[PDB]
Amino acid sequence: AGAAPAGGEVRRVTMYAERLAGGQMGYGLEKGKASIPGPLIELNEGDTLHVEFENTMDVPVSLHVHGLDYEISSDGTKQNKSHVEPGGTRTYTWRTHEPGRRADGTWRAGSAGYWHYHDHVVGTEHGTGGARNGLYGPVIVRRKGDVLPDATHTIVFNDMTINNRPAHTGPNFEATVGDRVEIVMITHGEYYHTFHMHGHRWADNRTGMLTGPDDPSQVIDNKICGPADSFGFQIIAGEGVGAGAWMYHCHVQSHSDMGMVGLFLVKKPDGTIPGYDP
Amino acid sequence: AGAAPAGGEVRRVTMYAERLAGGQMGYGLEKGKASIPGPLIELNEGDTLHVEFENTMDVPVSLHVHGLDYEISSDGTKQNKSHVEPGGTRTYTWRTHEPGRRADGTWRAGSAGYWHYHDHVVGTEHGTGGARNGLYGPVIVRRKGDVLPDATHTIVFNDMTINNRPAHTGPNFEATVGDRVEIVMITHGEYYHTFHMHGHRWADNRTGMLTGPDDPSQVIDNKICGPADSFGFQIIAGEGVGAGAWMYHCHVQSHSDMGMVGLFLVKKPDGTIPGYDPQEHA
Amino acid sequence: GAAPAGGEVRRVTMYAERLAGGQMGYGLEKGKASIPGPLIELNEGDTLHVEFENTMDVPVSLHVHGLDYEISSDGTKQNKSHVEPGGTRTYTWRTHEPGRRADGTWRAGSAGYWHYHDHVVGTEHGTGGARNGLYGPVIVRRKGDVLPDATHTIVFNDMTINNRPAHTGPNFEATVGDRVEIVMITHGEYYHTFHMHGHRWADNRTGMLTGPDDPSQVIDNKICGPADSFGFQIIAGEGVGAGAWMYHCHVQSHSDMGMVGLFLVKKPDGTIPGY
Ligand SMILES: [Cu+2]
Ligand SMILES: [Cu+2]
Ligand SMILES: [Cu+2]
Ligand SMILES: [Cu+2]
Ligand SMILES: [Cu+2]
Ligand SMILES: [Cu+2]
Ligand SMILES: [Cu+2]
Ligand SMILES: [Cu+2]
Ligand SMILES: [Cu+2]
Ligand SMILES: [Cu+2]
Ligand SMILES: [Cu+2]
Ligand SMILES: [Cu+2]
């Protein structure tokens, strides 16, 4: 496929927090276009992102990010006066760095990985109301040379829902056999979960794939996660197994039974999915 | 003793789902011989396994496997009509592959690992009643060169039970100091747990053993696990610690207090276990 | 600095003592018990004989994770190595280096972030003892391991941090650029997720990537359950600057009900802007 380049660009983007239907709340890149989860932010190690944020809502909101470099004034917490009053604006700055050798011979780990942002002030000073309402989104930081996927799908286990959706309503994702598909998997709220995919597996490391025959990372199809965990992987759709409606679900038994299930709909080249009948 | 050879053979096994005493259900390789946990299935990477499956019960049942390759017709779900009606039969096919490089340059991970199979249709569309009743078992897929154990033991944290056994009834496993002992650990149901072993430790990687001095995997004696998690390891029994009645238990405090505990009985060569009074462990 | 090779036989006295408010703790001298207990540090190959005294009116024990101990140092009533009220016992912990065995396999060393705790107070798995505060960290270093400028232990004990009242920390101070080591232990009934604002670490033995070839995930959030232990080292404020950097359990209601603390990273002049 493609390969991520070396980073180092200074980037800008506008972001809004807005109310959505039925007490929900979401982030968006354009007014009236908020979504749960929020827009995918992608950066290359070295990039700087200035987020020109605006709160269109009637209550304070903030933007807090995992993993990336930010100064304390972009913490997005009320305690550090980094929240945004109703109608207010503020520029959050996120920075990223390459790995490299420190002066003392140690190895500084880079920014790359599967990360996320979310509100930190709605409902409580820890964003408990903001997370419930839908104020979360994925951030991917790529290392130079990372393979780029054909498509990227974000799955958020938010309490007992997926992406704040009604029970038993997916979401479903479509691919064709051989597609390189990237899953970003984020958890929020109160519960632990176990994320599981039928017919596909991945390595429990940074990229979700073994670096080669010297990489001892476990290969899994079932992963325990809890509030604010994030991980990701790339799989080849239908590799070794073929086309079909491949279930993904939380494997906590009452959780799948109550509707934390969706489908990885993998099609043959002719567009068919053998045996699928919803 | 020994090492795993290269896979590539086409293997076949018969499997039966059967009701067992106490309202339980289990899988077995021979009729009337079901067990909880189900029979240990071991394959070498590259092997194919045809499972000739018969449901001897009055309710639909299925066979769903983690980790291994299978086409959608062997998914073992009602939704894809790969369940088995009462009294019915079906052949499930599991395949496995060796690691290698893709044309796009990336590494395709092999199937090797500590995996497991279980029912997917008893009680609910996700097998909630089936796993609770005992329809679960272990699958080990070995990579060429993997070290082989002197014995393999399977420990399943199924809800608040170990292997569906009553509280404070084990199971216990015996070995002799120096034995290479393999543990397969699987979790099912509703609850997270933490598996702990006294006197022994393992690496948090595929085999549970470090490859050599360049493996940075954390070495642990306590591992959080949730429903359908599976991992495994090998330990040298008593290595650097000696014989004795070595406890394993869930380390969630109320869980150990309520009976999620067992004993790794490591014997001296003369068959004796120092300091082991069984009634003091009751 | 860097860790030397181990191999020394050490001795130390340890006491179990009642503390205020129904609590209990370990200490190295009488009247100096603390929660969490004293940090025990060893180099792979060291032996530690713990000369243990129970100054309490109820039986107590000492049980350790990860280190090599014979069955007589199990610290369990079940194997009769608990300590009656007023009694004394010597517990012996050993450690070893990694190396190749005869069969050709690689024997894992003792090095890592581990912990000790009681096994007999309240129940025969020490449920009361952990709750009351009988726990503490153990670090076993491999030769050449980087040494930190300071070490702080964070224990998530049920819904508390280090048995502290809700929302009262503990707070830890550092200066921008300090090499700070965290030992993170969990006890009790609940799973948690440990999170630090402004910093990240590697999910491996040392919390540091060995170099460009280590594929471990870099994380700032980690799920942990009872008796899990892990540790890491971070450069305080590296790339982010001074500030009152929050750490907390990320299970939402847990941070709301008290599992929050501050990593107070100062400028070289000792000030924290905006705090
Ligand atoms: Cu769940
Ligand atoms: Cu499955
Ligand atoms: Cu967060
Ligand atoms: Cu499933
Ligand atoms: Cu448990
Ligand atoms: Cu222990
Ligand atoms: Cu499953
Ligand atoms: Cu124990
Ligand atoms: Cu918590
Ligand atoms: Cu954060
Ligand atoms: Cu936070
Ligand atoms: Cu313990």
Author numbering:
A (entry chain B): 40 to 317
B (entry chain A): 40 to 321
C (entry chain C): 41 to 315
Paper text:
Laccases (benzenediol:oxygen oxidoreductases) are copper-containing enzymes that catalyze the oxidation of diverse compounds by molecular oxygen. The active center of laccases contains four copper ions: A blue (Cu1) mononuclear copper center (T1) and a trinuclear copper cluster (T2/T3); the latter consists of the mononuclear T2 copper ion (Cu2) and two T3 copper ions (Cu3α and Cu3β). T1 acts as a center for the reception of electrons from the reducing substrate, while the TNC serves as a binding site for the molecular oxygen and its reduction to water. Three-domain (3D) laccases are monomers consisting of three cupredoxin-type domains. two-domain (2D) laccases consist of two domains and exist as homotrimer, with the T2/T3 located at the interface of domain 2 and domain 1 of neighboring molecules, and T1 located near the surface of domain 2.
To assess the accessibility of TNC, we constructed and purified mutant variants of SgfSL by replacing the amino acids, His165 or Ile170, to either Phe or Ala. One of the proposed T3 tunnels is blocked by the Ile170. When replacing isoleucine by alanine at position 170, the T3α tunnel was expanded to 1.16 ± 0.11 Å, the H165A mutation expanded the T3β tunnel even more, to 1.36 ± 0.14Å, taking into account the estimated maximum coordinate error calculated by SFCHECK, which is sufficient for penetration of dioxygen. Replacing Ile170 to alanine and phenylalanine result in a strong decrease in catalytic activity by an order of magnitude. The expansion of the proposed T3α tunnel upon replacing isoleucine to alanine did not increase enzymatic activity. Apparently, the role of Ile170 is not related to modulating dioxygen access to the TNC through this tunnel. We assumed that Ile170 is rather indirectly involved in the coordination of Cu3α ion within the TNC. Indeed, the detailed comparative analysis of the structures of the wild type SgfSL and its two mutant forms showed that Ile170 can affect (via hydrophobic interactions) the position and mobility of the His157, belonging to the 1st coordination sphere of the Cu3α. In case of Ile170Ala substitution, Ala is unable to establish nonpolar interactions through its side chain and hence it does not interact with His157, which may cause excessive mobility of imidazole ring of His157. In case of the Ile170Phe replacement, the imidazole ring of His157 can be more strongly fixed than it is required for the enzyme functioning. Both replacements of Ile170, inhibit the reduction of oxygen to water, within the TNC and catalytic activity of SgfSL is decreased.
